[PDB]
Symmetry: D4
Subunit: 202 residues, 8 copies
C-alpha cells in the first residue's frame, strides 16, 4: 500500500549544492533575507544531528563565485568537491564517491538553482535507488514558475518535497531528546518562535 | 478503476492537531481572521454530525502554548492527548490508541503546522491503511511555498485534499436531512452566504 | 502507456451545475467580469457544436437563488433538473438519468462551487467510468487555495483539467470546419482576439 | 524503478509552435519582455547545440499573424509548416512527417498558447511514445490558472516540465565543452549573469 | 506648523453607511471574513466609548438589501436613516440633521462602497468643515484599484485615512482607563492578540 | 477651505482617448475582460446622461489600429478627431476646439495609455482651468507601476481620480431620477449586481 | 521653494517604539525574517553613528511582552521608558523628556504597530516642530492596506518616509569616512551585497 | 495655479546614476528582463533626441562594480563622473559642474538604488530650482515597499514621476517629427508593439 519513508538521523546525509556568491543573485523566488536564513537553518540542523555533510560548487573560479563563507566556516572538515565542468553534480565521480562513502541511504539536498543544480543530481540519485528529500525553501531559482516546474519533475521521479523545519522535526522525532538544543535552532531561525520563547521566559 | 471514497458521517473521526496559542503565530499562509473562522467551522461541523473528535497538543507547557479555548469548550468529553515530546502525533501511543478506539476508518485531520503536525501523522495513518482527509484551509503553516510542498508530499501518499466546506457537504449529502441546522453552519462561517440568507428573509 | 483521450463533438455532453445568482457571490477566485465571460464562452461553445446540455440547480427556491437567465435562454430545450436536496448532483436520480440519456461518454463539466458542486459529481462520474473534462475557468470557488485542493482531488481521480478555450479548440479540431462561426466565438470572448480581427479587417 | 530520462543533444529536436505576432497578444501569464527573452533564449540554445528545429504556424494569413521574424531569421533552413486548419499540429501530416524525419525521440516543445497549441501535440506525441520536454517559460497563455491546468494535463500524461535554462544545462552537461560559447548564451539572456561576468572581468 | 487633529472620544461620532446584505457582495478588495470582523470591531469600539452613532442605508427595499443584523442589534436607539433615493448620504436632509444633532466635530465614517457611499459624504462633510476620519479597513469596494483612487480623492480633500485599530487606540489614549474592557475588544477582533492573552494567562 | 467639486450632468463632457485595437494590446494592468466591461460601462453612462462625447484616435491608419467599433457605434454623431501626429490630444487644435465647443467645465477622461494619452491632455486641461475627472479603471497602461506614477502626476496637478461606477453615481445623484434605466447599467456591468437583481426578482 | 532637510549624524536621534515579543506577532506586512533583519539593521546604524537612542515599550508586563533582547543588549545606556498606559509615547512625560534631553531636532522612528505606535508620536512630534524620519521597513503592522493608510496620514503631516538603507546612506554621506565599517553594515544586512563583497574579495 | 511643465527636448538633460553591474543585483522590484529593457529604452530615447547625457558611478572599483557596458557604449563622449566616496551625486562637485554645463534646467533621472542614488540628487536638484523628472521604471531598488516610500519623498518635494515611454512621448510631441525613427524605439522596447508593426506590415 504505502510506506512512510521518513528521515532517520542515522541514515541521512546533507548535500549543499552550489550556494555560491554569484549564483545566488539569480535566486528571485525567495527574498535574500528569508533564503539566507533558510539555508543557515538547514546547516544548523545538519550540524546539530551530526549528519555527514557534503559541499560542492560549480565553476567557482569564474562568475559563479565562491561558496558562501558561512558554509565553509560551519563545515570546515566536510568533503568539498569543486566541480570545474560537470553541471550535474552526479556526473562528477568525486562527488558520487563522497556521497556513497557516507553510507547513508537518505539524501537531504538543497542548492542553487533548483531546476538544475538541485533537480539534476536529485533525479540521478533517485535513479540509483537513493531516497531523496528536497529542502524546497533552501533551494532557489529564477522565479516561482521555474520552481514549480522543478517540483513537478522531481515529484514525478519520487523525490520527497520538504522544508528545513519539517526536515528538522522529522529528524528530531521527540522534543525530549534535546529540548534546549533543538529549541535554540527554532528560535534562531523562526523570529516568531523566538518571540514565544522570550515571552514564556518572563 | 477509480473508487469515489467519500466521507461517511458514520465512518469518520476528526483530529485537531496542535491548534495552540503559540504555534498559531507561525501561521502566515492564512490571515488570522480567515484561519480562525475555518478552524471553528470544521469544529461546528464535527459537533453537528456528532463525529468522534480527538484533541492533541505538543509541548503545551512551553512556548507552544495551550490549545485554543474554543476547542476545549466545544469538545469537553473528547479525548485530549497532551504530547510532551513526540512531534508526530502517531508516535504517541495514547493518541493512536484513541484514534483506533473510535473505530473509524476515515480520518479528517487539521492542524498546525501543515508540513509537520499535519503531514507526519497523515503519512503515518496512510501507512496503516486509513483513509485520510486533509482540511487544507483549517491547517496553517509558515508560507504558501511550505504549504504547497506539504500538499505534494501528502498527495503522493494518497491523502485527499479538501476544505471545511467540502467536508461538511460531503458529510451532509442532502439538504433535507437538516435544512436549518446545516444552513446555520454555512451562514455562521460564510458571511457572503449569511448575506444571501438575510436578503432572502426580507 | 498513455492514451490521448481528447474531446469528440459527437461523444461529448456539457453539464452546467449550479451557476445560480446567490451561489455566484461565493466565487472569489475569479473576477466577476472574467467568470461571467468564461461561463458564457463555454455556453456558446456548447451551442455551437450542438452538444447535449444539462442544466441543474441546488435549492434554487432558497438563498442559493435561481439559475442565471442566460443559460436557460440559450438552452430552452435542455433537461433542467432542480435538485431540492442532494448536494452531489450524481446522487439525484433524475440528473444521472438525463446524463445517460444523452449517450455521451465524455462529460464536460463546470459549476459553483468547484470543490463541491463540480468535484463531487466529477468523482462520481469517474467512478462509473466516464471521461470527465473539467472547465476550470468556468468553475468558481471561495479562493485559490480551495480551488487548488479541488484540482488535486479531481486530478488524482483521473479528471482532465482544461479551460473553455482548450475545450473549444479540442472540439473544433480544424479551423476550416467553420472559419466564420468559430472565429466569432473567439472574438466574442477574447477581447484581445477581437482587436486582432478588427485590425486585420482594415 | 525510475530512469533519469535527460536531454541528449544527439537525440533531441526542438518544436516552436505558433509564436505568431497576433497570438502573442493573448499571452498574459508572462510579461512581454520576459517572454520574448525566454523564447529567444530557447532559440539560441537550439542553434548552439545544432538541434533539428521545426517551425510551425496556425492560420498565419489571418488575425493570428505571421511567425515572429527572429525565428525565421535564425532557422532559415528549418522545416516550416504553415497549418491552414489543424489546431493540433500533430493532426497535420506534414508536421508529423517532419518530426519523424529528424529521427529524434526527444521532443523539446514551446509555443502559444500553452493549453492548446502546446498541450495538444504534446499529448499526441506522448501517445506515440515520444519523450516530451516542455519549455514552460517559453510557452505562454491567457493567465496563470489556464497555465496550471495545462501543466496538470501534460504532467498526468508523462510530459517533463522544464525551462530554457534547465534545457540548456541538461544539453550542455559540462561547462568545459564550450565555456565562452555557453557563457555567452547565459549572459545574453540572464541580465544578472551578464552582471556577474562583467564584474568578474574587471 | 502642524496640528495633530486626533480623535477625541468626547468630540467624535461614528457613521455606518450602507453595510447592507446585497451591497456587501460587491466588496472584493477585502475577504468576507476580514471585512466582517473589521466592521464589527469598529462597532464594538463605537459602543465601548458611547459615541453618537448613525446608521443609514440606500434603497434597502431593493437588490441593495437590508442592513446587516449586527448593526441594528448593537445600536437599537441610534438614528436610522433609510435613504430611498439619494446616493450621497449628505444629500439626505434627515441624515445631515442627524449628523449635526450629535454636535460632534469629528466624523468617523465607514461603509460600502468606498468610492461612492463613503467618499461622497466624506467630501461633502469636509466641505462643511467637519474633521473626517475614514476607517479604510471597514470600508469595502470592487477592487484595490478602485480603493486607491478613492483614497487619493479623499486624501486631497483633507480626510484622515485610518483603520479600526488606530481609531480605537486614538480614542482610548491610555490603557489604564479600562484595561479589561479595551483588551476584550482587541482579543475579540485580533485572533493573534487573543492568543497572546491566552498564553499570558497560563 | 475645501470645495467638493462633484460631477454635474449638465456641466460635464466625456473624452474617449485612443481606445484603439492595436494600442489595447499594450494594456496589461487590467485584464482584457474587466477593461472591456469598464470602458463600455463608461460609454453607457455617457449615453445615459446624454453627455457631450468626444472620440479621438492617434495615428489610426497605422499599427495603433482603428477605434474600437463599439464607441463609434454608440456615438455616431459625436465629434471624431483622428490625430495624425500630436501625441498629446490637447496639442491638436481640432480636439481642443471640440472640447470648448461643448461649453462644459467638467472633463471626464479615459483612454490608452494612462501615462501618456490620458495624463498629457489631463495636465493640459488642468492648466487651462478645466476640472478633470479621470476614470482610472477605464484607462489602461503597461503595468501597475506605470499606472501609479501616472496617478501621482495627475494627482499633484489637481486631477480627481475616479472610476466608472463612482462617475455614474455622482452624475445620477438620486436613484428616483430613473431607477430602471440606471439599474440596467449597473446590472449590465456588475455581474454580481445583476445577481442581486435576479434574486430580488424571484 | 523646497529645502532638502536631510539626516545629519550630529542632529539626529533614533526612537525604537514597542518592538516587543508579543506585538511582533501582529506584524504581517513584512515577513518575520526580513523584518528582524531590518530592525537590527537600523540598530547597527544607530550604534555605528553613535546616535542618541531611545527605547520604549507599551504594557510590557502583559500580553504585549518584553522588548526584544537585541535592543537591550545593544543599547545598555540608552533611556528605557516602560509605558504602563499611554499608547501614544508622546503622551508619556518621561519619554518626551528623554527625547528633548538628546537635543536632536531630527527624529528617526520605527516601531510596532505602524498605524499607532509609530504614527501617533510622529504626528505629535511634527506638531512640536520636530523633523521626523520614518523607517518604513523597520515598522510593521497588520497588513499592507493599514500600512499604506498610515503612510498617507504621516505624509500629509510632513513626515519623511524612508527605509533603513536610505537612512544609513544619508547619515554616512561619504564612503571614505569609514569604508570597511559602513560596508560591514551593508554586508551584514544585505545578503546580496555580502555576495558582491565576497566575489570581489577572491 | 497649476502649470503643465512638460519635457522639452531643447531644455532637458539625462542623468544615469550608478547603473553598475554589482548594484543591479540589489534591484528586486523589477524583473531583470524588464529592468534591462527599460533602462536601454531610456538610453535610446536620450540618444534619439540628442539630449545632453551624464554618466556617473559610485565606488566602481569595489563590490558596486563597473557601469554597464551599454551605457558606456552608447555615450562615449558623455561626461563620466566616477564618484569614489559621495553617495549623493550632488555632493560631488564634478557631477554638479557637469550638470550645469549642459545649461539644461529639466533633469531626466534614473538609477540604482531609487531610495538613495536617485532620491538624494533628486531632492538636492529640486532645492536648487531644477525641474526633476524621475524615470520610475528605469530606477530600481530592493522591493516595492522601499520604492513607494521613495516615491512619496520625491513627490512631496515636487519631483515629477514618469516612465521611459511617457518621457519619450513628451519629448517627441508629434509622430510626424520622425515616424520611422520614433517607431523603431517603440518597436525595439515594446514587444507587443513590435508585434503590431509586423502584423500591419503583412
Ligand atoms: C525576534 C524577532 O521577531 C525580532 C527581533 C528584532 C526586531 O530585533
Ligand atoms: C461580510 C458581511 O457578513 C459583513 C457582516 C457585518 C456584520 O460586518
Ligand atoms: C482563539 C483565536 O484567537 C485563535 C484562532 C483559533 C480559533 O484558530
Ligand atoms: C475588444 C475590446 O478589447 C474593446 C472593447 C472595449 C475596450 O471598449
Ligand atoms: C449575471 C452575473 O452576475 C452572473 C455571471 C455569469 C455566471 O452569468
Ligand atoms: C550571503 C547570502 O546571500 C546567502 C548566505 C546563506 C545562503 O548562507
Ligand atoms: C545588465 C542588466 O541587468 C541591466 C543593465 C542594462 C541597462 O544593460
Ligand atoms: C514578442 C515578440 O515581439 C518578440 C518575439 C519573441 C517571442 O521571440
Ligand atoms: Cl566536474
Ligand atoms: Cl509524546
Ligand atoms: Cl435532490
Ligand atoms: Cl493543417
Ligand atoms: Cl434619500
Ligand atoms: Cl494632431
Ligand atoms: Cl504611560
Ligand atoms: Cl565622490
Amino acid at each position: 500500500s504505502f510506506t512512510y519513508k521518513r528521515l532517520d538521523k542515522n541514515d541521512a546525509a546533507v548535500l549543499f549544492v552550489d550556494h555560491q556568491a554569484g549564483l545566488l543573485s539569480l535566486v528571485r523566488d525567495f527574498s535574500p533575507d528569508e533564503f539566507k536564513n533558510n539555508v543557515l537553518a538547514l546547516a544548523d540542523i545538519a550540524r546539530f544531528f551530526n549528519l555527514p555533510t557534503i559541499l560542492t560548487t560549480s565553476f567557482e573560479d569564474g562568475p559563479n563565485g565562491p561558496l558562501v563563507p558561512e558554509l565553509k566556516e560551519m563545515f570546515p572538515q566536510a568533503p568539498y568537491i569543486a566541480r570545474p565542468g560537470n553541471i550535474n553534480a552526479w556526473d562528477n565521480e568525486d562527488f558520487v564517491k563522497a556521497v556513497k562513502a557516507t553510507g547513508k541511504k537518505q539524501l537531504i539536498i538543497a542548492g542553487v538553482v533548483t531546476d538544475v543544480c538541485v533537480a539534476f543530481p536529485t533525479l540521478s540519485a533517485l535513479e540509483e535507488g537513493f531516497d531523496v528529500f528536497v529542502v524546497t525553501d533552501a533551494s532557489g531559482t529564477f522565479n516561482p514558475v521555474v520552481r514549480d516546474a522543478a517540483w513537478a519533475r522531481m515529484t514525478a521521479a519520487g523525490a520527497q518535497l520538504m522544508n528545513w523545519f519539517s526536515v528538522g522535526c522529522e529528524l528530531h522525532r521527540d522534543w525530549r531528546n534535546d529540548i534546549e538544543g533543538f529549541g535554540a535552532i527554532l528560535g534562531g531561525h523562526l523570529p516568531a518562535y523566538a518571540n514565544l520563547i522570550q515571552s514564556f521566559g518572563t
